Amino acid sequence: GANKTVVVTTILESPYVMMKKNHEMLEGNERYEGYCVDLAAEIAKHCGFKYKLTIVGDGKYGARDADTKIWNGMVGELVYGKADIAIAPLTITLVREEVIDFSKPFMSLGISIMIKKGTPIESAEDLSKQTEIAYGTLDSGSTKEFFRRSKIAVFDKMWTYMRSAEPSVFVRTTAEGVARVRKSKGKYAYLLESTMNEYIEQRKPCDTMKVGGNLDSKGYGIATPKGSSLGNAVNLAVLKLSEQGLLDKLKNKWWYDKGECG
């Protein structure tokens, strides 16, 4: 069959995908910049396809409704055939691996704690043993599922608190979670992946920090519909780009070369 345009689903998540400054006057793929935008171009080059970047319609990574069993987010766009590939900071998880294909990981990370500077919190155990400082996670993502499923004493205690906290401690986007840390004068801490935490730590106004070690160890992968013929070539491209040092170069470009806090 003749080549067709590969539909790429992704998510507005800094520094992976961001609107360029002049984006209102730009169109198509040129509206966007970031780590995943650069990565998409590299994957397309090595695999030999043309592509269109599209921002996921519901703004979500992907979770399965416990009642209706329907997948939302970027995972849903792959499951229902609305996109051909997802190039995003999409965490490789068991429940997702059962319904979509993943490349080997292009980035390693773990769940981490973001505080406003000066907050008297050093660890998840600290958060779990107090109630003055609220804390939460992103909706429809792997971090929330981590706490929902954990049998580790500290993390189960944190989940029991978060699921019933009022007002809600869950946010719709990472940016909302970060904004809540910044505006809460230290009374809200945010549970997010170390990649995004470390990025924000280097962005103005330089008022947040990552505390403690990571709570787990996992990776982001490029996702394709289960059984898609594109997955094999995409996986080999990730491995080649990793071994050539390109992924390290892109991490340095978007996290630290552009750091704003010194």
Place this chain on the structure above:
Amino acid sequence: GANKTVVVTTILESPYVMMKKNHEMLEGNERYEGYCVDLAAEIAKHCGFKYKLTIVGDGKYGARDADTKIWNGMVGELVYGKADIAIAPLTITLVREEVIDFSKPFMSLGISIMIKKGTPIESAEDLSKQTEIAYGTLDSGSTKEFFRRSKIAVFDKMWTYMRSAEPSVFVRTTAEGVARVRKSKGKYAYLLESTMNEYIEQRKPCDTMKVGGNLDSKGYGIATPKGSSLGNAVNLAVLKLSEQGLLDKLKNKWWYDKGECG
């Protein structure tokens, strides 16, 4: 077809696979202990197979002879059908992914530098810009291939030195490389994966240390022959064990609960 015993290829590499103290009086799988021995039992349980642990015949991880194109080590045992699965600290690489199947990674790591304490070396750049202190890597492994293929200025310079150094700076086993660091009074440094470096740093006589950051970022995966029906179930088992915290528990058990340097 009726179930048959799964032949597991692995390698004597501490703390992944080690001879038990009384091993001369033990037989079968009971001769061995370590992270990979525990992991094998967990994978077998979740996938529902019986298995026999076998130590790779040539003691190697796996490389392809540039002339004869033949694979040695554990990769060769899978390629030629002498083993059904490899449960070992086997690095996921492009050239291996082309000939065998890999699970998603069960451990993350990077290449690192081991010195005898007091050696005046802090980085790969330091090693590359001097000649008093020799340095080398393991034969037939992914670290040697890393330096052989690198186009990064510092690492290419190090390869050009290592490939022609006399006497040879390459070793046959990790243990030989560690012993050479310890006996060379600081005149040999060893390039090895951070996992093994960090383990040795916590073992008697506590005379080595890991210096500098990791040179790359990658992972170990469970390997199966290409197209093997076992790979799918093995991959889901790794992800479940990761998410249940078992891999973290096993890392703590074999690296740090058993640390000997404080």
